[PDB]
Amino acid sequence: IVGGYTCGANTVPYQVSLNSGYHFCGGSLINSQWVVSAAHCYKSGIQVRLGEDNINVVEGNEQFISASKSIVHPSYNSNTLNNDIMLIKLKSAASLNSRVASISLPTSCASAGTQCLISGWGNTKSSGTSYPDVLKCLKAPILSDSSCKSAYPGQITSNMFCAGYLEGGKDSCQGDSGGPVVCSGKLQGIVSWGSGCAQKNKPGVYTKVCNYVSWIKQTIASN
Ligand SMILES: *[C@](=O)([C]([C][C][C][N]C([N])=[N])[N]C(=O)[C]1[C][C][C][C]1)C1=NC2=C([C]=[C][C]=[C]2)S1
Ligand SMILES: [Ca+2]
């Protein structure tokens, strides 16, 4: 996250870190046994880490659970990143408490202008590299589809939406992928992609979660 702020130990209890010997992507806990992330974050040997603040220090509230199965969206396209969403099942149910909670799925889509909270352990510099050990947060509004498509002509689909500031300075970045975008208490987006980080006229692109609620609910119920 570039231009954001330190969230504070477990102020985002649904935020998880995907670990394959090191943090590589973010994720969102939707219930005791399931996590939602980006399909482009897929890989074998995934260990889900919950209740994390400083990902390089054991503070006492973390829960490390191995993934039993991964399900990338059936129509995920790695070239265009269309349908960039995947489900990850926990080998054993997570212990839900205060630092470890799930985030509700949307009942309907959010509109442009709506403010959301984007979080992650990704790069914090837009013209360099510096990865944080503590969870970073950023409040950003959903941008009009017109400004989104204008910024990325011929690249935006109905399964994506832009959020951030066209003036640059605040945005998600490498390391934040798969992470949450929560608007009005609902998981409306997943950190997907963008051109650079916090660059003017280049907002972050997020997977439009509201389009996948049926698939998510049906897939989880059948697995
Ligand atoms: C993701 O954190 C990044 C997101 C950058 C967000 N940029 C904004 N908001 N301007 N995604 C990427 O680097 C790409 C998307 C598809 C291919 C590359 C990460 N996801 C992964 C990373 C490393 C390894 C695997 C997935 S960083
Ligand atoms: Ca920790």
- Give me the domains of the chain, ranges plus CATH numbers: 1-12+103-210 (2.40.10.10), 13-102+211-223 (2.40.10.10)
CA nearest 53: which of 150, 149, 136, 122?
A: 136
Buried b (16+ CB within 10 A) or exposed e, 112-139: eeeebbbbbbbbbebeeeebbeebbbbe
CA nearest 115: which of 186, 37, 51?
A: 186
* Nearest-CA residue for atom 10 of ligand 1: 194
* Nearest-CA residue for atom 26 of ligand 1: 41
Give residue 57 CA to ligand 2 midpoint distance, Å: 4
- Contact call for residues 147 and 113 (beta carbons, < 8 A): no
* Identity of the residue numbered 188: Q
Q: Is the CB of 73 under 6 A from ligand 1?
A: no
Q: What technique was this entry resolved by?
A: X-ray
Residue with tokens 């799925």: 105
Experimental resolution (Å): 1.8
Structure tokens at 154: 């011929």
- Contact call for residues 98 and 13 (beta carbons, < 8 A): yes
Q: Which atom of ligand 1 is nearest to the CA of 196?
A: 10
Buried b (16+ CB within 10 A) or exposed e, 154-188: eebbebbbbbbbbebebbbbebbbbbbbbbeebbb
Cα Rg for the chain, rounded, in angstroms? 16
Structure tokens at 201: 């006229």
Structure tokens at 192: 């997907």
Give residue 24 CA to ligand 1 midpoint distance, Å: 9
* DSSP 3-state of 136: strand
